[PDB]
Design a protein around this ligand. Sequence first.
Ligand code: CLA
Ligand code: CLA
Ligand code: CLA
Ligand code: CLA
Ligand code: XAT
Ligand code: XAT
Ligand code: LUT
Lengths: 226, 213, 230
Amino acid sequence: DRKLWAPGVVAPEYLKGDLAGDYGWDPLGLGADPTALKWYRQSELQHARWAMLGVAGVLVQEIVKPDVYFYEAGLPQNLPEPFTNINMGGLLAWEFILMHWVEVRRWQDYKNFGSVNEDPIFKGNKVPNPEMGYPGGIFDPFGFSKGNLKELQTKEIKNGRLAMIAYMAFILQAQATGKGPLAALSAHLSNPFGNNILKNIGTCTVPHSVDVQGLTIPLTCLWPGS
Amino acid sequence: VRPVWFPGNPPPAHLDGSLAGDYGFDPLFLGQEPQTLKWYVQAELVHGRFAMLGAAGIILTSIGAKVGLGFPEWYDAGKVVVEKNNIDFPTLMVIQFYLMGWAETKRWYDFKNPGSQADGSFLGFTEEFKGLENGYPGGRFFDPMGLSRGDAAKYQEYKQKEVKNGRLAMIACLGFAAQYAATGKGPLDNLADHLADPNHVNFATNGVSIPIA
Amino acid sequence: SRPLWLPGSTPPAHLKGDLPGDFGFDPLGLGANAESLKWFKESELVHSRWAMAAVAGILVQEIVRPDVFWYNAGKEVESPLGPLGLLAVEFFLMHWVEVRRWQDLRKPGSVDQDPIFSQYKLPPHEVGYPGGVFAPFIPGDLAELKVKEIKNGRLAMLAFVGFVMAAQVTGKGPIAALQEHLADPWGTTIFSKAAVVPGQAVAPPCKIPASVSYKGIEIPTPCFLQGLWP
Ligand code: CLA
Ligand code: CLA
Ligand code: CLA
Ligand code: CLA
Ligand SMILES: CC(/C=C/C=C(C)/C=C/[C@@]12O[C@]1(C)C[C@@H](O)CC2(C)C)=C\C=C\C=C(C)\C=C\C=C(C)\C=C\[C@@]12O[C@]1(C)C[C@@H](O)CC2(C)C
Ligand SMILES: CC(/C=C/C=C(C)/C=C/[C@@]12O[C@]1(C)C[C@@H](O)CC2(C)C)=C\C=C\C=C(C)\C=C\C=C(C)\C=C\[C@@]12O[C@]1(C)C[C@@H](O)CC2(C)C
Ligand SMILES: CC1=C[C@H](O)CC(C)(C)[C@H]1/C=C/C(C)=C/C=C/C(C)=C/C=C/C=C(C)/C=C/C=C(C)/C=C/C1=C(C)C[C@H](O)CC1(C)C
């Protein structure tokens, strides 16, 4: 638990080091309810793991091809070779139903920890779930768990929290200048005084709407200014 | 101990937590009598009961409009239906007073005598109009699902869910008139204008709402 | 211990798995009053049996008559027995049948006898499940079939609404709607035909006329909740 987020700070009473990545933080009292701390733990794991896919998507989609820009990679004109100008209504129909299954199974693992472990179709192999948020079993095809699990459980968050801030960086280094993260890395490392945080905060490179097959989108930057 | 309308301030002495939607909000002490508060608990419900019917009525006829249907707006639905159907206007309103002034004095003698209206004085129906408590009659006709009996722990939850939707329906039907007198158009036209540009198409930019435009 | 509508959950206290098809699904508390549970247990079975007969009605009619469309087929049948002579028979022949079923609901030991052939008599059965004449040659266990009736029944009640809402959006029968989905899945969905973003609402139009003529006075044909469609 020790070596907190600041030197002279007393850790709160509900943060005695049980959970991983516990640094005596929460200066907003949100984990004071014990039943809310578990849900905020689950939502931290979700915001960590999607951001680690998000960071490993953005700085890999421009290494494989630094042509399609990740902010406008969702437009159907920018989709790859078997998917160019797909009906986005059909693709949303897949994604909604494929995710309303997965998430609700995960949600019922929150609400009833223990009555969601089995494959419901094939009453066969279970998933040995040691603690909430960490299913394992078939989610561990490599067996990298069952060692010092607490060590990797901290490594998942510390890489995860940095990936959350790096992915909100990946957005704000893209709305301010209209340029990719490794591309804004090139823009910094060419002239590191005219392409800094200065003279790009306060300009939004995003239009009011980009029409997708007959639909407008509000498309708002995270600060005003153009 | 309970959540109050204004944190810190205690609820008034006449307002312990037993009513639905009770949040201690009586700053003028208007429910200081325990028998006029029996009347205002009746009054908050039937105002909320009509406003829940009303606010659903404005919204559902405005959802149909602006999509392409032939619907009027709620301020113009009064004229257009006594003109399309050749309905004489005084003979429509008088029957509204006959049918409802029937249904209202039954309530007005539920409040005066709660055991009454259950003597077979009506067409034979006795315990349908018995009345369970203040503002909640129940029985066979007014609760045909039978939700006010069986589990009473969830019924107290439905009592609160009625008052919560009933409060902000009264605020909506106070806001539909306010969105019409200020702007001069339908409600979901005002919503879609607020969703077109959320800045500058709010209430502050009329010149009717703030005079310091 | 029994299977549920949602396996991690718990059933409510008024559902204890006594009834057939009791998977514990009643979030809106409607099975609390036991007087009103009998009314709903009857009305689920009645809603299921009409819908099973209707969905198999539309499916058989579509595989033998590709000419006419079932939403319009209440208008074009051209019976020689009149437009209202049919309705007059159906009115009286159902105001007999339903009221016999209704008195069975009210007093279950009151409707057992053939009134005009008093030598014949229904057995003292369960409410909503007549048997005797209505059930010869029952295959296997009776409670197995009692769950098979409702599972196929609940599947068919969702099927008929699926028939109607496909018949108002693409306007074609439910193999023609299936052939639209099997020829092109990615573009022939309701999420492909419609979307609402905050700022505009794109909904499909009706494939249904507003009115029909039908022999003199016109009959209004409305698209069930047009305007509230996505
Ligand atoms: C949405 C992401 C998210 C969520 C849900 C949590 C949740 C949690 N964190 Mg956590 N954290 C995050 C991101 C997140 N974290 C990031 C990005 C960092 C790196 C700075 C940290 C660093 C951190 C530390 C160092 C510690 C925690 C701890 C905790 C736990 C107790 C705190 C609490 O109750 O807050 C619940 C939190 C929320 C409900 C989130 C609310 C968000 C508010 C409403 C607005 C956000 C502010 C602003 C927009 C952020 C912008 C930043 C910008 C750079 C992008 C809790 C499980 C403590 C712990 O491990 O205890 C077990 C602890 O010691 N966190
Ligand atoms: C439609 C009228 C109406 C009536 C009769 C009541 C009646 C009641 N409310 Mg209630 N309430 C209403 C509307 C109403 N409410 C609305 C719209 C809201 C949302 C803002 C609330 C929110 C609310 C809370 C949060 C609480 C109550 C409570 C109470 C109870 C005690 C207070 C009292 O004596 O009321 C006396 C009420 C009146 C005499 C009627 C008000 C009419 C005034 C005199 C006219 C002026 C009002 C206002 C200034 C004008 C605004 C519009 C104007 C610009 C045209 C009582 C049962 C408390 C309670 O016990 O909960 C059950 C409580 O905690 N109410
Ligand atoms: C039920 C809640 C509700 C909702 C969701 C809306 C929504 C909307 N209103 Mg609206 N309005 C409401 C109630 C509501 N109104 C009421 C009660 C009034 C009368 C005071 C108004 C008066 C009003 C005007 C004059 C205008 C709008 C407009 C708008 C639109 C733009 C937003 C805006 O300008 O903010 C307006 C927001 C408010 C007035 C406040 C929101 C509701 C508050 C919380 C009142 C609740 C009562 C409070 C809790 C207790 C009162 C204390 C008292 C008892 C002592 C938006 C769609 C504008 C429009 O047409 O856009 C083009 C516009 O011109 N509204
Ligand atoms: C597949 C659906 C299904 C199933 C499993 C059952 C099962 C049952 N019903 Mg039931 N029923 C159904 C549909 C079904 N019913 C429909 C649609 C109606 C309305 C006509 C009824 C009307 C009804 C009555 C009135 C009674 C029963 C009774 C019974 C019980 C004993 C009879 C029996 O063995 O049926 C077994 C059923 C089958 C083996 C289904 C065979 C289906 C074949 C494949 C033909 C289907 C296709 C064909 C096109 C249908 C059209 C036929 C006709 C309209 C031309 C049993 C629980 C009796 C009872 O519970 O009393 C104790 C009783 O009295 N049912
Ligand atoms: C989940 C997430 C991002 C996931 C992103 C994904 C999947 C992106 C995918 C894509 O990009 C690719 C791959 C390719 C693109 O072409 C397509 C898309 C689809 C665009 C980010 C979350 C990022 C989440 C973040 C940054 C949250 C930060 C929250 C903070 C810092 C709050 C801290 C506090 O609240 C606490 C915790 C406690 C309080 O006491 C104190 C305070 C300070 C209040
Ligand atoms: C806002 C409201 C009441 C507000 C009262 C408040 C805040 C009082 C608060 C207080 O008292 C307390 C709590 C405690 C006191 O100590 C302090 C104060 C502060 C004094 C009622 C609205 C109540 C609003 C109601 C009842 C509206 C019903 C509307 C209907 C039925 C509309 C019908 C139609 O619109 C359709 C459906 C179709 C159209 O075409 C035709 C028509 C007829 C126009
Ligand atoms: C009673 C008795 C008695 C004695 O004993 C004997 C006997 C006589 C044998 C018996 C009888 C019986 C019977 C008759 C039965 C029937 C049944 C049925 C009909 C069912 C159905 C049932 C039915 C069902 C489930 C159905 C289902 C359906 C579905 C899913 C559908 C779907 C769809 C849709 C939406 C639309 C699209 O576009 C396509 C499709 C894909 C097409």
